[PDB]
Amino acid sequence: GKKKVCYYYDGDIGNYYYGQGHPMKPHRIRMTHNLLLNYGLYRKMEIYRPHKATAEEMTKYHSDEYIKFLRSIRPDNMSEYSKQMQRFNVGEDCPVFDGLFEFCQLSTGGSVAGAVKLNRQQTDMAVNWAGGLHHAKKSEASGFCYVNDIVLAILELLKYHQRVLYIDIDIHHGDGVEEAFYTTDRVMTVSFHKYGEYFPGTGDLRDIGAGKGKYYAVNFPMRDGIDDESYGQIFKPIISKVMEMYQPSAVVLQCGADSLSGDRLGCFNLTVKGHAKCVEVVKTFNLPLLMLGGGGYTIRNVARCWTYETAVALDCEIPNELPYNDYFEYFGPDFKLHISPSNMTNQNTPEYMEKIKQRLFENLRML
Numbered sequence: 050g051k052k053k054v055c056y057y058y059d060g061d062i063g064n065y066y067y068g069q070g071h072p073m074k075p076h077r078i079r080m081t082h083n084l085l086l087n088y089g090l091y092r093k094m095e096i097y098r099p100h101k102a103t104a105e106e107m108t109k110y111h112s113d114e115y116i117k118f119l120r121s122i123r124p125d126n127m128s129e130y131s132k133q134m135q136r137f138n139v140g141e142d143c144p145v146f147d148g149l150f151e152f153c154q155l156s157t158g159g160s161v162a163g164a165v166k167l168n169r170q171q172t173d174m175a176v177n178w179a180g181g182l183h184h185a186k187k188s189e190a191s192g193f194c195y196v197n198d199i200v201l202a203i204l205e206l207l208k209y210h211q212r213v214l215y216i217d218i219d220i221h222h223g224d225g226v227e228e229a230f231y232t233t234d235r236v237m238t239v240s241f242h243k244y245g246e247y248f249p250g251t252g253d254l255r256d257i258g259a260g261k262g263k264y265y266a267v268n269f270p271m272r273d274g275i276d277d278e279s280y281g282q283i284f285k286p287i288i289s290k291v292m293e294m295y296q297p298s299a300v301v302l303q304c305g306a307d308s309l310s311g312d313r314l315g316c317f318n319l320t321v322k323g324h325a326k327c328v329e330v331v332k333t334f335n336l337p338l339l340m341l342g343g344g345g346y347t348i349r350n351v352a353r354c355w356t357y358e359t360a361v362a363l364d365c366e367i368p369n370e371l372p373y374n375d376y377f378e379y380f381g382p383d384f385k386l387h388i389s390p391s392n393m394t395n396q397n398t399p400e401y402m403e404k405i406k407q408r409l410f411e412n413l414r415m416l
């Protein structure tokens with residue numbers, strides 16, 4: 050039936066700034082929040098402010114040296130950490146900005162707090178749009194991500210769940226999450242992503258895990274221009290098979306919005322309805338679910354996407370006419386919730402989609 054939804058948000062998150070021209074804009078989290086408040090979605094869910102995750106909570110995965118560096122580095126002492134910045138990959142993509150550590154603590158706090166709430170059986174769904182920073186590694190920042198809130202939230206879920214399923218619909222391969230759990234069967238990672246001359250360069254369908262984790266990493270490589278029809282016809286069959294074979298007791302769904310049509314960095318052609326169909330599909334399985342954010346660089350579309358996905362989590366139909374809000378002008382010229390796909394060519398032929406699906410089904414028979 051309808052599910053209890055707990056949502057995490059810190060009003061300060063929107064003030065963190067990566068720097069002039071940097072595509073990652075924490076302000077998109079505040080736009081999302083303001084839009085769903087204006088649709089009246091706060092009446093249907095419990096809103097929590099995350100705690101600031103401690104260096105200690107973060108070292109459940111990250112190395113002590115990397116976390117110590119994140120806690121110490123500031124724009125005023127950068128010149129003294131030249132060697133450490135290189136070692137930890139903090140620079141152009143992952144800049145040093147005022148309040149960087151606090152931004153990581155809030156992003157992480159929401160995901161970990163959501164996992165605790167699910168473990169305690171106090172909610173059916175937990176949402177943290179500031180989370181989903183899937184590229185961060187054990188001792189390295191990567192692709193605008195510094196602390197892997199997903200890995201930390203999964204480790205929390207593993208205290209009470211024998212098997213956890215991770216699903217990643219961000220346009221980028223969920224490399225940091227797959228790497229953390231590559232050699233274990235206690236977490237199955239499933240990533241759908243653009244593959245070929247594209248960041249981070251991993252996620253070939255031949256990457257299936259290693260040791261006890263062999264067959265527990267699933268990668269669906271895609272080309273430019275995937276649309277709602279093509280994505281929908283592959284997502285429900287893959288997730289259904291994964292649910293059937295793996296039988297997880299909890300799910301983490303990374304909802305990176307950079308897979309939408311018109312994304313500044315992305316080359317896909319999904320609409321908000323096509324992206325949200327993934328949430329609807331995962332919801333039908335009736336398992337404890339942690340919904341996270343991720344990429345998304347055309348901020349008006351990110352706000353539309355995550356507002357609609359929160360409405361989906363609540364089984365609440367919301368009008369297409371956008372209500373007035375603090376960022377109303379960002380949604381011009383149409384002022385509608387839903388988006389139209391572009392006329393870009395879909396390089397993912399129906400035969401290619403069926404062929405990759407068939408190759409992945411062969412691997413799933415090995416469970």
Ligand SMILES: CCCC[C@H](NC(=O)C1CN(C)C1)c1ncc(-c2cc3ccccc3nc2OC)[nH]1
Nearest residue numbers: 069070071072141142143191192193221248314344
């Ligand atoms: C989702 C993560 C995407 C990361 C990607 N980075 C890379 O491809 C670099 C090359 N590798 C050594 C990593 C990337 N794509 C675009 C950028 C980018 C970074 C910027 C940093 C400071 C300022 C502007 C930037 N503009 C960018 O793209 C327009 N960075």
Ligand SMILES: [Ca+2]
Nearest residue numbers: 217219221241
């Ligand atoms: Ca992905």
Ligand SMILES: [Ca+2]
Nearest residue numbers: 230233236265
């Ligand atoms: Ca695994």
Ligand SMILES: [Zn+2]
Nearest residue numbers: 219221307344
């Ligand atoms: Zn991404």
